[PDB]
Design a protein around this ligand. Structure first.
Ligand SMILES: OC[C@@H](O)[C@@H](O)[C@@H](O)CO
Ligand SMILES: OC[C@@H](O)[C@@H](O)[C@@H](O)CO
Ligand SMILES: OC[C@@H](O)[C@@H](O)[C@@H](O)CO
Ligand SMILES: OC[C@@H](O)[C@@H](O)[C@@H](O)CO
Ligand SMILES: OC[C@@H](O)[C@@H](O)[C@@H](O)CO
Ligand SMILES: OC[C@@H](O)[C@@H](O)[C@@H](O)CO
Ligand SMILES: OC[C@@H](O)[C@@H](O)[C@@H](O)CO
Ligand SMILES: OC[C@@H](O)[C@@H](O)[C@@H](O)CO
Ligand SMILES: [Co+2]
Ligand SMILES: [Co+2]
Ligand SMILES: [Co+2]
Ligand SMILES: [Co+2]
Lengths: 249, 249, 249, 249
């Protein structure tokens, strides 16, 4: 009886309600942003989130993302910056995570993120040290803060527990807090507390998002190399696959 | 009788009211963001904006900016990207422009911006072609849209009219519109319509802001060259000076 | 296969999501307000709204109401006003109507309402003349405006069409409009346009709400007569019954 | 040098900024609501609030009120209720109080109020017992809660201190709290804490407001007696006068 997809009704009610919530919070959500790629389920065994639904409070890895901007920022750059442009760009999106649900452990080789909680509270789990990239020297300036240890009783998705092992640093973000920076090459994940009366709504402002997803499969590449380039590295292999497509029956 | 500064009372009422407006619109404004550098007057002859005040509707070049993020995004970058990092980074700020007032004509060599109107309407004036940088090849991808001609009856600041000559393209942005990208090297300016019942409030998401201002004079430089580096080029010379400091009597 | 109740999952996702939307729009929703009486289905044949769900856009009579205040306002009144107190009082609630759905035709003998659209648009159908109450003279001051005729193509609930016959006056309300008064004794109904991208959210400020509902069955009566007193008169008999209780399986 | 009026510039910047704040918080403010009666100064010696301004934090009695509704609710009432209609009606308004400022001690013979804090925090001072009205029996149901004693260090307006003597009960209201009822005949006053970073914004839902003010001098009376009827009883005589008119030079 393990779900393997989400019904069209479950998908729409989930995504359309989320888009309305976004508008209420003044996020500029256009029609094109409300599509079949906005609702994400990280892996086949994560569809079980829809057995009891998004308000069950159960630990599953799924979320909604409404992307309002993913600008390469390639125009006006000196030609020499061509091979390093992929680390820049501007990506603005609204992320909605229901109680107990998670944006699973992963890291980006090029994308640096920043978080602004709009509604609810965000519990971020991360590795304070970056992932070492063999054979390449990396610049350093502020690094990541050590943060605090995890609070007790954090329910993790069944069969995904170990993927969180290395994300020992923890921080709870709220509306009004200083913007929070998640440097590239750092493992990170986050969830909405299970006892939350509202979905976690977060505004993410980051560098360009390289993702040959479903809603982004057919566009033009600003720079040759960018073509097909992937910048998502999920700790759990089950997460990497289902990320680029949601099975809607 | 030409004003040469702004009284402490005029400054505070202007900036503190704006910060409250920002909070109401859910922008994460912290205490440190509400400072003596947030309220900007572009040039000595622009202080006359305070003869009749911010609700007079008169054409002057002055605005408020509450910066919530100006992240270099240098961490995790390969060393080779060092000389091109200045074109990246993440800068999030809230800008408040009162009726009739303007963010004066200028362009950035490195910073690419994007606009999201939160309240009111934004009238953007810009040059659809970038400024040619002698002796250097530049990348290209989307360029800037031609836009529309200026509507009639746009009152410009006295003695600043000609600075707008080259910003022939025009567009009026509203809340809910697609994010608007202003590529680096493009001349641009914007104002809040004079008949607006509310101040124009805009969320700007751009690449790093290189500005050795008053509230940013003493920090650490992520990369050597960044030190003292300026990235603001106002068409009117009077604007470049008063930009980095507000005279509060 | 005609639904006869709503599953606990359908109920919670419907009501809890609505409460979150309410909070985002700054309505003061407390825990006690989010209960099993907030989600209303007007009649047994209206449960079919949940065959395709609240985002189907189909015409059904169901809505959500989060009541933040229902103050008798009896304290401090001269004893003589006792028999007329039932026409006063203060009731503040947030109403959420999904696309295509309706608050069915009905009128109140004592309650006068006022509407403020917070999100979406509200299409009100009403009778510009009050219902004559046999053997009693009534005061008059402003009466109700004639309004406009119905726009074409308004899909009404199957088997409930005729209940709308007398509500010939029509008006479409939006956020920012002047408060709209619906005097007592006037037939009225309203819906969220079927093509709306967001649920209709309306703040109602009215006189006391006399309703021996499920969440209001056991309180104390400020005045003797008020006990058991009913003030809802739905045109369709099917609506009056299911109003005071929602079948949650 | 004691101010005796408010300049047109001080008035407009105060009221127009407040109206913008109101809109941001989604209060339906129309053009007609933004008038010369919205900004209130309670007495000649209260104009000194404008010596240092609304952000000085100093204790003065002045506030802004944007009334969106003041419905008699007389239509549909049985003729017998005519002499008691004045205790009913529906009045919806947004009140804005700057740091340290107060809505001065007063009570209403007919109007019962309810408070909903939208922004900031509201400190209410009141008398838990109603004012006895000689020769008339009054109904009772819930009465007023005893509340808590005043916190220490509450700066009161100079020369108005004693007017607060009897308002010994205290409560601090915040956004999201249950609606707060202030029954008619109860002395009450409230202020925005002096250390607040934002103005106190409160939505008031009450029974009809009988006030032959400046913006309400020339309308039609729903009931004969209502004509000229006053329902404001300020403890300080200086407050009653300046209430109905603001001196704008
Ligand atoms: O799938 C997650 C998506 O790519 C988000 O924008 C960020 O990485 C979450 O950290
Ligand atoms: O102001 C700094 C902020 O609170 C966080 O510590 C950093 O963004 C983490 O990268
Ligand atoms: O002084 C203007 C400031 O630098 C702003 O962030 C942008 O450039 C306006 O286009
Ligand atoms: O969606 C594109 C947007 O409306 C504007 O045309 C561009 O951002 C301009 O750069
Ligand atoms: O069931 C409807 C409820 O009683 C509402 O508050 C109003 O009457 C709708 O007009
Ligand atoms: O301002 C009046 C408003 O627009 C409506 O016409 C009335 O409230 C209807 O009762
Ligand atoms: O002048 C105060 C005004 O009348 C307000 O609506 C309430 O009474 C304040 O309690
Ligand atoms: O819920 C009751 C509320 O908190 C206040 O105690 C009353 O309205 C006071 O009248
Ligand atoms: Co990420
Ligand atoms: Co610029
Ligand atoms: Co009704
Ligand atoms: Co009062």
């Amino acid at each position: 009886s393990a779900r393997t997809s989400i019904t069209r009704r479950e998908y729409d009610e989930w995504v359309r309600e989320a888009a309305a919530l976004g508008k209420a919070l003044r996020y500029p959500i256009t029609e094109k942003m409300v599509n079949d790629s906005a609702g994400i389920v990280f892996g086949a065994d994560q569809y079980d989130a829809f057995k009891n639904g998004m308000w069950s409070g159960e630990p599953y890895e799924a979320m909604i993302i409404f992307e309002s901007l993913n600008e390469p920022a390639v125009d006006g750059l000196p030609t020499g910056a061509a091979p390093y442009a992929e680390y820049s760009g501007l990506c603005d999106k609204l992320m909605i995570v229901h109680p107990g649900k998670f944006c699973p452990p992963h890291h980006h080789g090029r994308k640096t993120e920043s978080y602004e909680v709009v509604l609810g509270e965000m519990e971020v789990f991360y590795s304070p040290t970056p992932s070492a990239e063999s054979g390449v020297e990396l610049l350093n300036f502020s690094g990541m803060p050590v943060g605090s240890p995890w609070p007790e009783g954090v329910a993790l998705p069944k069969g995904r527990e170990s993927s969180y092992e290395k994300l020992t640093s923890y921080v709870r973000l709220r509306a009004g807090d200083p913007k929070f920076v998640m440097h590239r090459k750092h493992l990170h994940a986050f969830r909405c507390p299970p006892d939350s009366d509202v979905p976690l709504v977060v505004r993410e402002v980051s560098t360009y998002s390289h993702e040959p997803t479903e809603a982004a499969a057919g566009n033009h590449a600003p720079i040759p190399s960018w073509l097909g380039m992937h910048d998502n590295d999920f700790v759990s292999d089950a997460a990497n696959t289902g990320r680029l497509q949601t099975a809607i029956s």
